[PDB]
Design a protein around this motif. Structure first.
Motif, PDB file in Angstrom:
ATOM      1  N   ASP A  27       0.831  -1.194   0.000  1.00  0.00           N
ATOM      2  CA  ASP A  27       0.000   0.000   0.000  1.00  0.00           C
ATOM      3  C   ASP A  27       0.867   1.245   0.000  1.00  0.00           C
ATOM      4  O   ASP A  27       1.905   1.292   0.662  1.00  0.00           O
ATOM      5  N   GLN A  29      -1.090   4.253   0.301  1.00  0.00           N
ATOM      6  CA  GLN A  29      -1.986   5.142   1.024  1.00  0.00           C
ATOM      7  C   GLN A  29      -1.865   4.963   2.531  1.00  0.00           C
ATOM      8  O   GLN A  29      -1.726   5.942   3.269  1.00  0.00           O
ATOM      9  N   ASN A  30      -1.933   3.723   3.010  1.00  0.00           N
ATOM     10  CA  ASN A  30      -1.839   3.506   4.448  1.00  0.00           C
ATOM     11  C   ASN A  30      -0.452   3.859   4.957  1.00  0.00           C
ATOM     12  O   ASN A  30      -0.307   4.466   6.025  1.00  0.00           O
ATOM     13  N   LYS A  32       1.425   6.107   3.647  1.00  0.00           N
ATOM     14  CA  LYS A  32       1.464   7.560   3.613  1.00  0.00           C
ATOM     15  C   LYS A  32       0.776   8.155   4.828  1.00  0.00           C
ATOM     16  O   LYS A  32       1.282   9.102   5.443  1.00  0.00           O
ATOM     17  N   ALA A  33      -0.379   7.610   5.188  1.00  0.00           N
ATOM     18  CA  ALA A  33      -1.103   8.112   6.344  1.00  0.00           C
ATOM     19  C   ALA A  33      -0.300   7.917   7.615  1.00  0.00           C
ATOM     20  O   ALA A  33      -0.247   8.804   8.477  1.00  0.00           O
ATOM     21  N   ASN A  50       5.807  11.717   0.457  1.00  0.00           N
ATOM     22  CA  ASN A  50       5.456  10.734  -0.556  1.00  0.00           C
ATOM     23  C   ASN A  50       6.645   9.849  -0.894  1.00  0.00           C
ATOM     24  O   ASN A  50       6.516   8.624  -1.007  1.00  0.00           O
TER      25      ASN A  50
END
Ligand SMILES: [Mg+2]
Ligand SMILES: [Mg+2]
Ligand SMILES: [Mg+2]
Ligand SMILES: [Mg+2]
Length: 81
Positions: A27, A29-30, A32-33, A50
């Motif tokens: 992933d 997104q996770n 990144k979060a 990023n």
RNA sequence: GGGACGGGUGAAACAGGAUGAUCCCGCCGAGACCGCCGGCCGCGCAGGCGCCUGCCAAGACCGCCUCUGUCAAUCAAGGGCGAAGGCCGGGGGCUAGAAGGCGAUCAGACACCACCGUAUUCCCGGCCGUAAACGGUGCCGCCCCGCGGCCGGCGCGCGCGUCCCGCCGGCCGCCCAGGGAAACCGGGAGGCUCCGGGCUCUGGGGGGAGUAUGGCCGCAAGGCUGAAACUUGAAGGCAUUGACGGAGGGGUACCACCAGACGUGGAGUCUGCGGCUCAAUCUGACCCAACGCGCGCACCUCACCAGGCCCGGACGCGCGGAGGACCGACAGCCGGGCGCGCUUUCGCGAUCGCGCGGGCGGUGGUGCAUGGCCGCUCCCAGCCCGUGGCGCGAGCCGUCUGCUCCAUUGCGACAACGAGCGAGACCCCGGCCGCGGGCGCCGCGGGACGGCCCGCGCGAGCGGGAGGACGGCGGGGCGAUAGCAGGUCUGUGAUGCCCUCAGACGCCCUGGGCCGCACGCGCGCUACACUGGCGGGGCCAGCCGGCGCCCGCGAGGACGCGCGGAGCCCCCGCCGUGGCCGGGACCGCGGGCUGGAACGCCCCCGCGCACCAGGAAUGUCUUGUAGGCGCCCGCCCCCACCGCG
């Protein structure tokens, strides 16, 4: 591009071994979060965040395929026998 | 036999060929030479030594309870040997090949490359007696870390292999100590300033000079021996850092190339640069890294040329002065002009006059005395600190001879470990979506990360396909250490030292000039036409932005208010390859604008220059790019072929 400066690598390693539980091997997104989360890190910018996340993804899927040097990922438990 | 070239070179050209060459085969002659085996093998006093067979003499090494008994080491004088070239006298004559000749190359080439070719190279007899004749290391003798290879001979052991364990002798490699200026030696260049085993030879800063003059030898060429005067302050050795290489190996970039495009150098003209002229035609800069650049020169700007007003001489000391310091003016001339000067007589009032010190000012010099700012090295990827280690030391390692990256960007190792700057990150602009606000589209955020799939690669990372507004440094800004005798004293209340300072290089006025033109060249503009020129019409931009009415062919003008955008291109016609209606320089009448002032800029009629795509030479460029088309700002009273966009 392909410029992975020292900072990115060192940081990614450091945040990885302390968060193997909160991350996943592919992933973006996770990861990144999690990097955006303040308890773990402070990334003064966006593009830095990023890039760090991407390197973390590559690092973790490399791990899952097999162990990586320089990462103390608690694997002593499997090899303590 | 067969029938047309062959030789040679980087490429060619001289010599050979229908008298048959080159090529194939066979025979004949002569003279050199001894291949692959051929070697950290070997022999020899050194120089040197390699076909078969046979003969002659010799030699070191090993083995030995064979003999003698100090007979030895090293050496002026003397004697012998001594590569190649060279010489004398005889033989021989195939290869190569000094001299010589000839063809190329070059500016020249009498040299390097090609071809022919004499002495010589071969044998006998005899001279010469030199070589980087080198291990650049004299001979005899003793001690001395460890590992290994090869040659010759002898002995031990066994499981009998040309095995392994030793001894002597020889030829080699690496190396601990130690030594040394170091390179390096270590079978000594060790055991030596802690400086004495024996013998012989040589040297005493560099040149002059291995020369002159004598002597000896030699047929000669030449060899051995071997000065002085004079001159000179360094010459040399080993090593370090850089720079350079017509050195090697890896990388990279349209200020490099390949593939292509558009140009310049061709003409006319704008502008800048050297030369000529002039009273002046003010000056800086000269490969990249000077030449529309030091932000538009009629006056100023302005420095230069010909002429004239003013002191705006601060502040201190001495003297003088209101019984009058200094400053203005009518008439009438001289004068470009002005109470500038002149023939005279009215004024004004200490704001001072003169001398001595001392100021102010100056687009005056030195940028090779300086600061600051720029340019270049550099459209680069490199630069350094603390602790430690190696070296007497200058210095080295860290900071990489591997794999990747546009990148000292990273991976992975290493007497190094650990940090930092630069690079990236960062800032502005643009492209897609969301929220909010809203006179006028503008404030805050999300989004893309080599993330997904497939191939590879230990790894960093490379190639392809997707989905997506956008796909792998999208365009700009900032810009390391060290440095240049780069430019700027003419940008400044930035400045050191010089020069000018009351007939001024200060300041102000009037004119002229910076623009003058037999000549060489730098950036640009306009064209050479039909993929076109002229006339009419239709229509869309962005940095951003002001208009009505009436006169005048127009350019422009008088009034009055706040409101507002083009070329190419497209459609219809004329011209019809003619230096023609392509091109618009030059010149002759005329109408206006700016301004105190035209030499400046606009418009109208007529005249109608060079130019047919440009030699040797040369510049720029990869997507909304080149090119083509026009529009705004800057400097500016007027004016853009320039510059930023
Ligand atoms: Mg001879
Ligand atoms: Mg010698
Ligand atoms: Mg001694
Ligand atoms: Mg001497």
């Amino acid at each position: 591009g392909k410029v992975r400066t020292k900072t990115i690598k060192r940081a990614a390693r450091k945040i990885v071994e302390n968060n193997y539980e909160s991350l996943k091997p592919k992933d973006f997104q996770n990861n990144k979060a999690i990097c955006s989360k303040r308890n773990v890190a402070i990334i003064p910018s966006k593009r830095l965040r990023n890039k760090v996340a991407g390197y973390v993804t590559t690092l973790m899927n490399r791990v899952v395929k097999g162990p990586v040097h320089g990462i103390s990922l608690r694997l002593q438990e499997e090899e303590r026998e």
